[PDB]
Design a protein around this ligand. Structure first.
Ligand SMILES: Nc1ncnc2c1ncn2[C@@H]1O[C@H](CSCC[C@H](N)C(=O)O)[C@@H](O)[C@H]1O
Ligand SMILES: Nc1ncnc2c1ncn2[C@@H]1O[C@H](CSCC[C@H](N)C(=O)O)[C@@H](O)[C@H]1O
Ligand SMILES: COc1cc(/C=C/CO)cc(OC)c1O
Ligand SMILES: COc1cc(/C=C/CO)cc(OC)c1O
Lengths: 354, 360
């Protein structure tokens, strides 16, 4: 029918679906979205030739090649567009920023999700996808099949991707934690907080900024900590969390549990229980898997991240709120609180006492 | 109506940026599903309910990996979120809920039909490592000029396919399966091949289209013309004469020349050179039959438009000046190469069939 026509066209759209994130990657790497944000008012539009005039190029085709990339981004509403008729009767397009561009260009604090997109579309993280069929048939982890070691060991050998990853995570966490800290009061009154797997320390620096008397420890692998900027109030410390974690009044773990199997999460969580005082807690910041494969963007983000963990991590996966309760119970915690949520990230507390 | 920025609108904007960041997971997970034969296993193995569990799928894979079922479930859950497959939920003994899966309407074109073809080989082409590589050179092409594919490989795509036998095969089969489906539909509706003595398919690939034309019109002389490395492989279809060459030098003579998905591979200058060659290869009453997408008036959100604009982005990555064109632009190419008549004759699956008529 028109029915068969629609099914065929959707199949073609799926086949070429990687054109969208790769076009967007090129637009971000060329600084297009920043040039648009600084060159016209928030509600205005700019031509591809005026954008290209701010790139360091003499390529006569740069305007049309940008138009082609921007038209693909416009079709998905990543940028806005308006049409302007030409004397020939042909029409050209001028482009503006759509609401998603607020998160793809630097905000008042100089952060966005653009480094996160540059991480997600890096050649290094695309390669494991070619080994997913093998891992399903033969066992194993697609990343390890591509690289011969686990991802964190690999990042300790490839300095470029270590920095790309750490910056991707730091920028994404800055945006999420800025929102959580406006709503969540669970750090108030702590003497010491430990960010286990804290990366380059962005979250711990924001906690100490909000609560200047808190003593904060940012704990991660030593190839990450070596790149961590100094921040007043934060002590950076290298190590392996599965051997033990630093003591504190609370331990914060953001996007750690979803990297690991249930068994490895229990080992880590018991190390955290051992590190806390009797009345201490673990503050767990993670997505929560929805109950069905619904088409919403928020659910797609979680299920995309579940698929990433499948490709990258040994046993990592997304979990439901009950599955998080089960991890807390089996590692000895007695209370469980869903305390706040921001950009899909829920903040749960695993309380040693209830 | 103006949407006033709020917490709620900022959540949706943030999440769409995260979805974009990881959007390649969808075609790469669908690639793995197809390579594992999961959609074919589902099509052939429905219980009479029409829904199958990941364990039941896994049981049919050449595997003894006991994590295969849960791995499949996770892949299928991403596919189901995008309506590539369907699901149903069933409550387990422990009170946990399991998913069972079914084929969604798109799967009619991702599994073999009655003629044994689908768009599955096209998806394997589009997601092949070789064709993902040029995307890392897109920013370079914009800043330096040139072609992302040539920056990755040090030669043009056709030259590269002549050096890499595995990808040449993957490409020729992706195109022949796709073109078989579209051509079957065009041949039901379009009458322009009737009464021709000789048809030349220029850039015909392995010749699937020429073989369809002669099957329908057994009195026609059919020539399949392409590069020697494509022709070498090509099935010896009854009634098709294969000829290797380079179309920019010239093309075989015929009453009509058919070019499907050729113009969109090449710059305007290249197209003018090709279409002048065609003009010279035709009798006075001859025509070029051109099967291509047509760019819509605006970058609207429809799937049909998106397909054309995805293909425009594929041509930017792969091809020497290739791009999608509007009907007015195809008309301008026809006039600029000497043709006096132009008509849009038919359309199937977004592919329009245009005729460039030597005499109007
Ligand atoms: N065995 C281990 N000990 C300590 N940290 C580890 C680890 N294995 C992995 N990690 C760290 O776990 C972090 C996971 S990514 C999450 C980073 C940060 N919490 C955020 O949300 O931005 C990485 O920084 C990684 O280096
Ligand atoms: N210079 C040239 N002369 C002849 N054919 C060429 C050519 N350069 C590229 N091609 C061919 O152009 C075809 C483009 S792909 C489209 C193939 C076929 N018409 C279909 O629609 O299925 C390929 O088969 C390629 O080898
Ligand atoms: C492997 O560690 C992670 C990798 C990735 C992979 C990012 C590439 O899209 C994402 C994460 O949070 C979503 C992680 O904790
Ligand atoms: C190199 O020429 C083509 C490449 C491609 C690339 C297919 C991979 O998505 C598609 C075509 O028709 C759509 C072409 O004529």
């Amino acid at each position: 029918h028109s029915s068969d026509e629609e099914a065929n066209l959707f199949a073609m759209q799926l086949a070429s679906a990687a054109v969208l994130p790769m076009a967007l990657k090129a637009a971000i790497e060329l600084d297009v979205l920043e040039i648009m944000a600084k060159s016209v008012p928030p509600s205005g539009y700019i031509s591809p030739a005026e954008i290209a005039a701010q790139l360091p190029t003499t390529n006569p085709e740069a305007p049309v090649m940008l138009d082609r990339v921007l038209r693909l981004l416009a079709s998905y509403s990543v940028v806005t567009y308006t049409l302007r008729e030409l004397p020939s009767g042909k029409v050209e397009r001028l482009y503006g920023l759509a609401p998603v561009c607020k998160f793809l260009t630097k905000n008042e604090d100089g952060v966005s999700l653009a480094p996160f997109l540059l991480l997600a579309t890096d050649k290094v993280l695309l390669e494991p996808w070619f080994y997913l069929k093998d891992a399903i048939l033969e066992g194993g982890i697609p990343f390890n099949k591509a690289y011969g070691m686990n991802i964190w060991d690999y990042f300790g050998t490839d300095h470029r991707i270590n920095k790309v990853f750490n910056k991707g995570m730091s920028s994404n966490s800055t945006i999420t934690m800025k929102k959580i800290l406006e709503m969540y009061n669970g750090f108030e009154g702590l003497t010491t907080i430990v960010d286990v797997g804290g990366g380059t320390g962005a979250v711990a620096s924001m906690i100490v900024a909000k609560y200047p008397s808190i003593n904060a420890i940012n704990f991660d692998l030593p190839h990450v900590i070596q790149d961590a900027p100094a921040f007043s109030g934060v002590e950076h410390l290298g190590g392996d969390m599965f051997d033990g974690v630093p003591k504190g009044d609370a331990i914060f773990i953001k996007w750690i549990c979803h990297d690991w199997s249930d068994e490895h999460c229990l080992k880590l969580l018991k190390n955290c229980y051992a590190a806390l005082p009797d009345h201490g807690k673990v503050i767990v910041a993670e997505y929560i898997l929805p109950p069905s494969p619904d088409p919403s963007i928020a659910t797609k983000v979680v299920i995309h991240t579940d698929a990433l963990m499948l490709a990258y991590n040994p046993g990592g996966k997304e979990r439901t709120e009950k599955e998080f309760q089960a991890l807390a119970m089996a590692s000895g915690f007695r209370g469980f609180k869903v305390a706040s949520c921001a950009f899909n990230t829920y903040v749960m507390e695993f309380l040693k006492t209830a």
